[PDB]
Write a protein that binds this ligand. Structure first.
Ligand code: CL
Ligand code: CL
Length: 101
């Protein structure tokens, strides 16, 4: 149905350990750009600055998906990200959204 066409262009920082995702969160809250935090801490897409690219509805693990579609589009100077981090079976994610349809 139509909702299957919904999509977000998503960027994340993924860490399996809570202590480490909290270190990443502290860096965001100090003003560090999201891609630079992802390079430092993310265990996925680190070499892409956390960028997952576009992901359609149904393609994301459940808690991630719900969190991502709840975020408005933002840019990395004016980010809007998940706080607190979102737990999935991959670990803890901090997510921002750069595009929406
Ligand atoms: Cl600016
Ligand atoms: Cl999950």
């Amino acid at each position: 149905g139509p909702m299957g066409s919904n999509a977000v262009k998503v960027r994340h920082i993924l860490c399996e350990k809570h202590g480490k995702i909290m270190e990443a969160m502290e860096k965001l809250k100090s003003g560090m750009r999201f891609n630079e935090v992802a390079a430092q801490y993310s265990e996925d897409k680190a070499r892409q600055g956390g960028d997952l690219g576009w992901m359609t509805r149904g393609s994301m693990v459940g808690p991630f998906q719900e969190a991502a579609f709840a975020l408005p589009v933002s840019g990395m100077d004016k980010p809007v990200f998940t706080d607190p981090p979102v737990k999935t079976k991959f670990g803890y994610h901090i997510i921002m959204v750069e595009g929406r349809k």
